[PDB]
Structure formats: C-alpha cells, structure tokens
Design a protein around this ligand. Structure first.
Ligand SMILES: [Cl-]
Ligand SMILES: [Cl-]
Length: 129
C-alpha cells in the first residue's frame, strides 16, 4: 500500500509516534517519505547482503529475520515480510525499539540526510490530525 501523506501521519499518530522519544510526527512522516516514498512494499538490498523492508526500511542485519542474512539478529522478533503489510503496526513497533537504541533517528540515513534540521512540521501541515 502506497499511503497518502496525511493518511500516514494519522495512522502514525494512532500508533503512538507523535513525540515518541522526543521526535514530533513530522520527523516520522518525513523519514517515511524519503526511506520508502510511503510505500509499505518497498525493499532495498544493501551491499552487505542485508535487506531493508517497508515504510521505514527496517534492516535485516539487526531487526527482522528474512532467512538470507547470515548471523543476523532478529531484535524485533518478526519475519521481515511482516514489515511490508498495509497495516503499519509491526513497522511502528519495531521502529519504537530502534529509536530507543541510542542513535535515535540517526539510524535512518534518509532522515539524518534529508529531514534532520529541516522544517519537519511541513510534512504534517494541512492534515486533520
Ligand atoms: Cl512535526
Ligand atoms: Cl534522540
């Protein structure tokens, strides 16, 4: 499913992301924009043989099991395929754990490079939240 911007903001608000660990909702919408273009089915293979999955591009080295990433952790205890669902619950639950881990949202390269220090509120502007 390819979400709308305000639709995504709304589903994220409902799953507790607005202000989770101090990151306003605009940050998470922005991250999703640039990580996956709001598409829950997005996959990107990394050079280390790991794969990023879903709306927030959660990585198979650490966070989810995809069966083809040698000696990987499954820190979110999910098959990575569960991250590609139209229901964003599993992605949101795994992300809350990632962002608690110490790097905060710096764990997402697109956020660090494209959202951090920008006016992230723009991404929720005009949405009935
Ligand atoms: Cl915001
Ligand atoms: Cl932080």
């Amino acid at each position: 499913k390819v979400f709308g911007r305000c639709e995504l903001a709304a589903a994220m608000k409902r799953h507790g992301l607005d202000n989770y660990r101090g990151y306003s909702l605009g940050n998470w919408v922005c991250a999703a924009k640039f990580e996956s273009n709001f598409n829950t089915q997005a996959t990107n293979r990394n050079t280390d043989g790991s794969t990023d999955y879903g709306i927030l591009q959660i990585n198979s080295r650490w966070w989810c099991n995809d069966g083809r990433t040698p000696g990987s952790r499954n820190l979110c205890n999910i098959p990575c395929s569960a991250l590609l669902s139209s229901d964003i619950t599993a992605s949101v639950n795994c992300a809350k754990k990632i962002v608690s881990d110490g790097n905060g949202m710096n764990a997402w390269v697109a956020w660090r490079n494209r959202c951090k220090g920008t006016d992230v509120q723009a991404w929720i502007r005009g949405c009935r939240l």
